[PDB]
Design a protein around this ligand. Structure first.
Ligand SMILES: C[C@@H]1NC(=O)c2csc(n2)[C@H](CS)NC(=O)c2csc(n2)[C@H](C)NC(=O)c2csc1n2
Length: 1157
């Protein structure tokens, strides 16, 4: 499903030369760095030769060694010269490698995007039909961006890394006859351990995902019908399943975190064991006497650099593989032969045609389906100078005759002749330009009408084309109405009426001045005043040239002299219209409250201290590392060098073991702490959402899926925002600080030199990342114009086809893409120069460090063991800082954002709810009054619904309120349970207001029933028992409830009876009975008042007979307010008190017939 070796089809010879020089530049750099490393080994060998104790007399002999110290200084100067030469080479090669590879891509992308646009806009409409409009643009944008990035930088970097690893292993050929054997034999152990630990971690991650899946599902189902939840107030009764699922998820996550931490610790342990074994073997080899320690050190460093190179090569090859599929796809759009070309050489065209089309054997339909036939063959012919009208259900499905006229589609065996000759011989562009169309929707360009008229056809003169706009509504519509100055109209402001749009479309058609005109729904569903005027323009266009018309209303049929229309493919004559029947017509977190949220500092605190000792591993490492060189620096060869080397190897191994156990304890504490925090946050936040009022969920910004994702993925962000980060802070700062202090104790000059130079490279890297990001964002912003052109063109693709003026679109797209293309070349050189500059700064820092170290050694003030000590300590500490900060769990980024979102939603103060302050009366005489209360949706106060309503209810009355809009009326019911809060009026229940009430107690005494009976993923009984939340639990009273609701037969029919469970809609219950079980749930609460809006969800109308039976039984049992926009429901209601918007009272049907039907 991908392609390779052929994605560079459009590459030019200069482009291939650019690539050839670039890749060569990469091998050069990749070879150069291990050359630096080998010269470091020769550097350590020179120091070893100088620091030979030899005879005890020699120490103070030769003028205290002053002469050969001068020789050493000369050698050091030569080595520094070679160092800076290599640095300049690294800078010279880097500029060319990054710039050329990117430059070539810049040109490659410039060619490929233009070719893609040309092909896609040259494609036939049927291809677009089986596709969409937005996803074409999205595919274009993301695929070209990926290809650009990949073939711009990633391939060059990959060749660089591959060459680095190679050159390291060319050194490794010899230096590794003994060393590579052992080092590259212990490396596969590291690889296998990493692989098995990654597999175990992935298995644990999948297990915890499947464990949390149940919690996610229950969250989704409770949030979907949360209105029912707040109607029953089951939040307290809720969350136990959520709590248990989170408990299981937390327990599995503890194991997951333990596994990840032990995997990482094993990684450290294998690294350190490899170090120890390699140095043990190297010390033995150098002690053999035929070898120098510098060669061991340089081969070991070179193979480490090769490992670094292999590790760095992975993202680049991944990006290349990702871009391969996008390249294959984008090329697959290319090279597809369309049905028509419009640019073919075979374009013979007759001159001054009369348009006497003849039609025969028209068998064609939508190409998307080959089962339904729309055109069944029409033996129709037309004549010049006579307007023809088509009448029927539509234009043969949907104006498909028009699609036939200009070759939008390709009829099968459909023979159509414009004047007696086949359309195949005629040029596509000529055929399109000699034919004019009228769109059913006059949608236009987001720009001034002048260029729209220019788009219509070649403007001979602006005044001439303006004269052509002499159709009815001329001048007042073109100038008096659009700001008088010709103005950009379109989606971006300057809206005009549909009459203006149709009129300008007619004007464009007249500018085309075709021999044959096409009219498709000129005033389809337009204003009655908008029509009856543009039809005059249509008529005055029709006397000029022959045309076909399809009319929205039969009036044009009267206007048309010839009426040849039908439906179903049965051709009818056009002699007269008499046969035609009488058709009717958010700030960041303080980071301290977040930490304080973890009130579990004991199981926390040790980890910090544990982390601290971990920070001591890195510099202490270098210490023993330096001492290894200290073995073979100035000292006595035979007394203890073997024993000293063995002792320091044992120190390496015990250091690795203590690091392993340290990181084990670190994991065992931070994982547990983070897991307990994850559980605590989820437990609190879920209660927070169930606590929030209905309005909070109504806001369209937050949706059920959005809140579920908030519960799902806004925890791992905290896992790393709270406990792992402080561990990173403490370990990193302890490492760097102890390295600096040991440097200061063991060094006085070069220590500060390194401490000063490393920050400038760090800030250079940071600023060049910042500049790359800024340039990328600037480019994405300034391609917005080209994106706008592409979107506007593709959205109006049918209009583009209907209008021959199409190459102009390619022209503006090319210009608005080449300006960013020029910006791309300008960015390429800058990117290359900065990357080369930072590499040169790194190499220069290295060279200066070595020069100063050697110079101060010539002063005889710090021994090589100390110079190498401080240098390796600081550099490896900085490397550890970098690796740990990247191995760190994404602190900030999307984590602190989700953290403050979690804090906001938890601390959200909603309208008072679940508040115990609400007064609760012992008994309710159902004294509900609804007089003088006005309110609407808080999210959209645009419509002040519920205006001037007066209503009052006593015990036993059946209030059959029936407003014209059921959904609008639903709000009146929604107010009784305070889903929304009234402000204009007050509602009094039992003679006292409802706002000063125990929300739950009010809800408790309210048997609401929703029109849509959504129930949970629980059993038939577990759902009916949900009504008695915070109440007496129903034990076998459910039998009485079902008997009262008369659904006993269906509960009895179920195999497990009450136990039968509605599991993920398995054994799905009948549509006409879910409302019944909801009614049973409502009557379980046994309230003094019930609310019903059942209406009729489905069309079964049989269980519907049973549902009003249950409703009348309930209403004779207890007082009820029933809402139903159904004639049968209101007629069945004995107490007909139908009132709409407060206009009438009591029985409307007796007062007036308006209520009836
Ligand atoms: C897994 C990841 N490492 C690599 O991807 C990697 C590729 S090559 C390489 N390491 C070389 C030879 S394997 N290593 C050293 O030169 C070295 C000297 S000290 C030191 N590492 C300290 C102990 N390491 C970390 O703190 C640490 C945290 S994460 C991490 N390393």
């Amino acid at each position: 499903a991908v392609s390779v070796l052929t994605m560079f089809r459009y590459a030019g010879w200069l482009d291939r030369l650019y690539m050839l020089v670039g890749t060569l530049a990469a091998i050069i750099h990749g070879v150069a760095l291990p050359l630096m490393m080998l010269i470091f080994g020769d550097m350590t060998d020179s120091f070893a030769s100088v620091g030979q104790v030899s005879k005890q007399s020699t120490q103070m002999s030769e003028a205290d060694k002053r002469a050969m110290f001068a020789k050493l200084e000369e050698e050091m100067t030569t080595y520094a010269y070679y160092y800076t030469g290599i640095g300049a080479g690294v800078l010279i090669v880097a500029y060319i490698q990054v710039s050329f590879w990117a430059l070539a891509a810049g040109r490659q992308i410039h060619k490929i995007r233009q070719k893609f646009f040309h092909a896609i806009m040259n494609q036939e409409i049927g291809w677009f039909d089986v596709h969409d409009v937005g996803e074409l643009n999205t595919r274009l944008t993301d695929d070209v961006s990926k290809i650009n990035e990949g073939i711009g930088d990633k391939i060059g970097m990959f060749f660089q890394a591959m060459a680095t690893f190679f050159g390291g292993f060319i050194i490794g050929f010899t230096r590794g006859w003994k060393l590579t054997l052992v080092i590259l034999a212990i490396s596969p152990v590291l690889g296998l351990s990493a692989g098995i630990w990654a597999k175990i971690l992935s298995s644990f991650t999948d297990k915890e995902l499947h464990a949390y899946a149940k919690a996610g599902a229950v969250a989704e189902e409770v949030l979907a019908a949360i209105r029912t939840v707040i109607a029953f107030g089951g939040q307290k009764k809720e969350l136990e399943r959520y709590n248990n699922n989170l408990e299981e998820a937390k327990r599995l996550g503890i194991k997951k975190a333990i596994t990840a931490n032990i995997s990482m610790g094993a990684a450290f342990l294998l690294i350190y064991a490899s170090y120890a074994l390699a140095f043990w073997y190297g010390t033995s080899l150098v002690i053999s006497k035929e070898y120098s320690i510098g060669q061991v050190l340089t081969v070991f460093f070179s193979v480490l650099i090769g490992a670094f190179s292999v590790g760095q090569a992975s993202p680049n090859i991944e990006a290349f593989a990702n871009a391969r599929g996008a390249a294959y796809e984008v090329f697959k759009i290319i090279d597809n032969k369309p049905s028509i070309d419009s640019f073919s050489k075979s374009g013979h065209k007759p001159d001054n045609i009369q348009g006497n089309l003849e039609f025969k054997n028209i068998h064609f339909s939508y190409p998307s389906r080959k089962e339904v036939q729309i055109l069944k063959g029409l033996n129709l012919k037309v004549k010049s100078g006579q307007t023809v009208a088509l009448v029927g259900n539509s234009g043969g499905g949907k104006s498909t005759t028009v699609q036939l006229m200009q070759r939008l589609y390709d009829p099968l065996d459909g023979m159509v002749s414009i004047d007696g000759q086949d359309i195949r011989t005629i040029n596509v562009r000529y055929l399109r330009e000699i034919i004019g169309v009228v769109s059913q929707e006059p949608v236009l360009f987001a720009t001034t009408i002048a260029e729209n008229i220019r788009y219509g056809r070649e403007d001979v003169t602006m005044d001439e084309i303006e004269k052509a706009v002499k159709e009815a509504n001329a001048y007042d519509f073109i100038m008096k109405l659009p700001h008088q100055f010709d103005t950009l109209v379109g989606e971006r402001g300057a809206q005009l009426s549909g009459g203006q749009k149709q009129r300008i479309a007619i004007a464009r058609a007249l500018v085309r001045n075709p021999k044959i005109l096409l009219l498709d729904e000129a005033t389809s569903a337009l204003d009655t005043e908008s029509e009856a005027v543009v039809q005059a323009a249509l008529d005055k266009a029709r006397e000029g040239r022959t045309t076909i018309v399809i009319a929205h209303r039969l009036s044009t049929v009267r206007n048309a002299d010839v009426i040849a229309g039908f439906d179903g493919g049965v051709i009818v004559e056009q002699g007269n219209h008499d046969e035609l029947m009488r058709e009717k017509g958010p700030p960041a977190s303080f980071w301290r409250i977040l930490k304080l949220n973890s009130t579990e500092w004991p199981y926390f605190v040790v980890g910090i201290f544990a982390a601290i000792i971990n920070g001591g591993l890195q510099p202490a490492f270098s210490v023993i590392f330096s001492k290894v060189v200290g073995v073979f620096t100035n000292g006595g060869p035979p007394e203890t060098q073997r024993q000293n080397s063995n002792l320091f190897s044992l120190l390496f191994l015990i250091l690795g073991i203590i690091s392993f156990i340290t990181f084990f304890l670190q994991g065992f504490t931070f994982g547990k702490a983070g897991e307990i925090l994850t559980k605590r946050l989820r437990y609190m936040v879920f209660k927070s959402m169930l606590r929030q009022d209905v309005s909070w969920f109504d806001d369209p910004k937050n949706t059920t899926g959005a809140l579920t994702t908030r519960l799902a993925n806004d925890a791992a962000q905290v896992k790393g925002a709270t406990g792992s980060r402080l561990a990173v802070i403490f370990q990193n700062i302890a490492n760097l600080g102890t390295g600096i202090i040991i440097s200061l104790i063991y060094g006085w000059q070069l220590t500060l030199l390194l401490l000063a130079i490393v920050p400038i490279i760090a800030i250079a890297g940071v600023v060049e990342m910042k500049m790359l990001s800024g340039q990328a964002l600037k480019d994405k912003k300034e391609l917005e114009g080209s994106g706008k052109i592409a979107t506007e063109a593709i959205e109006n693709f049918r209009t583009v086809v209907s209008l021959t003026r199409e190459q102009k679109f390619e022209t503006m797209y090319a210009q608005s893409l080449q300006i960013p293309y020029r910006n791309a070349m300008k960015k390429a050189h800058v990117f290359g120069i900065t990357f080369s500059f930072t590499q040169a700064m790194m190499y220069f820092s290295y060279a200066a460090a070595f020069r100063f170290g050697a110079y101060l050694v010539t002063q005889q003030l710090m021994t090589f063991e100390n110079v190498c000590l401080v240098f390796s300590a600081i550099v490896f500490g900085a490397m550890a800082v970098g690796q740990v900060s990247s191995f760190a769990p994404d602190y900030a980024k999307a984590t602190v954002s989700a953290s403050h979102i979690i804090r906001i939603i938890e601390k959200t103060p909603e309208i008072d709810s679940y508040s115990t302050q609400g007064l609760k009366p012992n008994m309710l005489e159902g004294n509900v009054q609804f007089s003088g209360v006005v309110f609407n949706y808080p999210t959209r106060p645009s419509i002040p619904v519920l205006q001037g309503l007066s209503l009052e209810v006593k015990k036993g009355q059946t209030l059959a309120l029936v407003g014209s809009s059921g959904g609008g009326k639903s709000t009146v019911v929604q107010l009784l349970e305070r889903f929304y809060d009234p402000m204009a009026g007050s509602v009094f229940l039992d003679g006292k207001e409802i706002k000063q009430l125990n929300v739950q107690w009010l809800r408790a005494q309210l048997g609401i029933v929703s029109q849509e009976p959504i129930l949970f993923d629980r059993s038939i009984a577990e759902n009916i028992a949900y009504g008695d939340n915070s109440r007496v639990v129903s034990y076998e009273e459910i039998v009485r409830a079902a008997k009262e609701a008369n659904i006993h037969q269906f509960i009895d029919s179920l195999p497990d009876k009450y136990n039968t469970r509605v599991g993920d809609k398995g054994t799905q219950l009948s549509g006409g009975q879910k409302q019944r079980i909801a009614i049973a749930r409502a009557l379980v609460r046994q309230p003094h008042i019930l609310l019903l809006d059942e209406a009729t969800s489905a069309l079964d109308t049989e269980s519907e007979k049973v549902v009003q039976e249950a409703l009348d039984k309930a209403r004779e049992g207890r007082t009820v307010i029933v809402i139903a926009h159904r004639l049968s429901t209101i007629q069945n209601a004995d107490l007909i008190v139908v009132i709409q918007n407060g206009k009438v009272k009591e029985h409307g049907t007796h007062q007036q017939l308006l209520a009836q039907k």
